[PDB]
Enzyme design. Structure first.
Site, short mmCIF file in Angstrom:
data_model
loop_
_atom_site.label_atom_id
_atom_site.label_comp_id
_atom_site.label_asym_id
_atom_site.label_seq_id
_atom_site.Cartn_x
_atom_site.Cartn_y
_atom_site.Cartn_z
N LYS B 32 2.04 4.06 -15.68
CA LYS B 32 1.32 3.84 -14.42
C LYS B 32 -0.17 4.10 -14.65
O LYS B 32 -0.55 5.15 -15.18
CB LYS B 32 1.85 4.78 -13.32
CG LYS B 32 1.18 4.54 -11.96
CD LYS B 32 1.88 5.35 -10.83
CE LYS B 32 1.66 6.85 -10.96
NZ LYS B 32 0.23 7.27 -10.79
N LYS B 62 -2.87 1.34 -4.80
CA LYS B 62 -2.69 1.65 -3.37
C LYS B 62 -3.47 0.65 -2.50
O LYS B 62 -4.32 1.01 -1.68
CB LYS B 62 -3.14 3.10 -3.10
CG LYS B 62 -2.31 4.14 -3.88
CD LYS B 62 -2.68 5.58 -3.52
CE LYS B 62 -1.84 6.58 -4.28
NZ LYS B 62 -2.12 6.48 -5.75
N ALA B 64 -4.91 -1.56 0.16
CA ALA B 64 -4.98 -1.28 1.59
C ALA B 64 -6.01 -2.10 2.33
O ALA B 64 -6.75 -1.55 3.14
CB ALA B 64 -5.30 0.21 1.80
N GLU B 68 -5.63 -11.48 3.39
CA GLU B 68 -6.32 -12.39 2.45
C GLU B 68 -6.89 -11.72 1.22
O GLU B 68 -6.82 -12.25 0.10
CB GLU B 68 -7.47 -13.10 3.16
CG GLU B 68 -7.08 -13.72 4.47
CD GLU B 68 -7.48 -12.86 5.67
OE1 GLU B 68 -6.71 -11.92 6.04
OE2 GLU B 68 -8.58 -13.12 6.22
N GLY B 187 2.87 12.98 -15.59
CA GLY B 187 1.56 12.79 -16.17
C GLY B 187 1.11 13.92 -17.08
O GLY B 187 1.46 13.95 -18.27
#
Ligand SMILES: Nc1ccn([C@@H]2O[C@H](COP(=O)(O)O)[C@@H](O)[C@H]2O)c(=O)n1
Ligand SMILES: Nc1ccn([C@@H]2O[C@H](COP(=O)(O)O)[C@@H](O)[C@H]2O)c(=O)n1
Lengths: 204, 214
Positions: B32, B62, B64, B68, B187
């Site tokens: 990731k 993420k 947001a 479009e 991580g």
């Protein structure tokens, strides 16, 4: 805190050549350009310094930062290091996420714009209901720059009452009764004659 | 997917990121990556992870924005080589659907972020978490990424998305997390370890011992 002609170009193109062409053609009318991830992910973050060094544009990075505090800090630092004068941040992830961005801005001498609301379809599901509380949260975090939703002036009147007369507000004639500057994209950047389109708009 | 272990490569320097990912490649094939690394090194680094290690990449962007613009971000991201992208649900159904449509066109995947657990998440996100997850189910979203804390929150999310959905979550681990998530995201414990490969190998053994059904 003064945008040339109260008109901000929303450069939502993703191609460097068209992006630079349009920007250069309207620079005699506009000095502030808002760019998003489509352009910078496609051409690289170095395009920001290109806009600044080439045209002397102030750059607002419309990245709608919405991560945790530590990650928001890193995104802002990278964006300001690339040359952005300001960055747009979401309020829905809460106060600490916004504070992290504001702190990098204070440290680097740049600015943060808080997105208080959105007006696209689906914004009514969660954002609309949180908008007033997010604007108020911004005022209490010392936020001085806000981005309003693409909507009728009546609604900006309400937002203006919340943020006060001193805050700077930008939003996509009547709009300028409440916003300090209006944001225009397609009608300018897809125009066969971008300069004429900008000149016409400024006629108000 | 491989070993139910996903590497959260959060370091910002290209050298260490590539180095660490390469060292654990024997145990981890899914990584990731977020904006800090990508904005600092360029989107080309995604193709580099894929072309060099055969890694599956999840862009933790993420997303947001409006429909479009979300479409363009997803398209730019999948074009660069990302196998999947993480998207926020708070902006609404149409914004999430825009991402699903591009993923459908390009043969990639969308992961819906339904809640967060950092300080401040309680102001607006926490209260909307269940409704956002149910929105995802209604949109046909099949991949979800859960919050970093409280396994009591994972059981709830799993209950809403059902057994047929895919759920990945950060970290009695790994056991605790894998009771509900299909894969755990790790991580620091791996990329800050002196022998990253040893850290991953260890984690994988624990997961082996769980004998997780399906
Ligand atoms: N539904 C929409 C559509 C566009 N916009 C904003 O207005 C800007 C310019 O839009 P135009 O290209 O349509 O003039 C966009 O970059 C975006 O930030 C919005 O806030 N809501
Ligand atoms: N406070 C934190 C720390 C990490 N995380 C998530 O967990 C991932 C890996 O975390 P670790 O380094 O703690 O294992 C991160 O990339 C992030 O997405 C989080 O959601 N909140």
């Amino acid at each position: 805190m003064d945008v040339m002609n109260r008109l901000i170009l929303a450069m939502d193109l993703m191609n460097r050549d068209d992006a630079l062409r349009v920007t250069g053609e309207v620079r005699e009318y506009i000095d502030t350009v808002k760019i998003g991830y489509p352009l910078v992910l496609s051409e690289g973050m170095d395009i920001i310094a290109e806009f600044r060094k080439r045209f002397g544009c102030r750059i607002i990075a419309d990245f709608k930062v919405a991560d945790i505090p530590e990650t928001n800090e890193k995104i802002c630092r990278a964006t300001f290091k690339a040359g952005a004068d300001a960055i747009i941040v979401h309020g829905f992830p809460g106060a600490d996420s916004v504070r992290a961005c504001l702190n990098v801005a204070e440290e680097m001498g740049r600015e943060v714009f808080l997105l208080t609301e959105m007006s696209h379809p689906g914004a009514e599901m969660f954002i609309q209901g949180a908008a007033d509380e997010i604007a108020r949260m911004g005022v209490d975090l010392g936020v001085k720059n806000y981005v309003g939703p693409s909507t009728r002036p009546e609604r900006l009147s309400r937002l203006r009452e919340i943020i006060g007369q001193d805050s700077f507000l930008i939003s996509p004639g009547e709009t300028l009764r409440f916003a300090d500057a209006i944001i225009v994209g397609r009608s300018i950047y897809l125009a066969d004659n971008p300069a004429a389109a900008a000149a016409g708009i400024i006629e108000s």
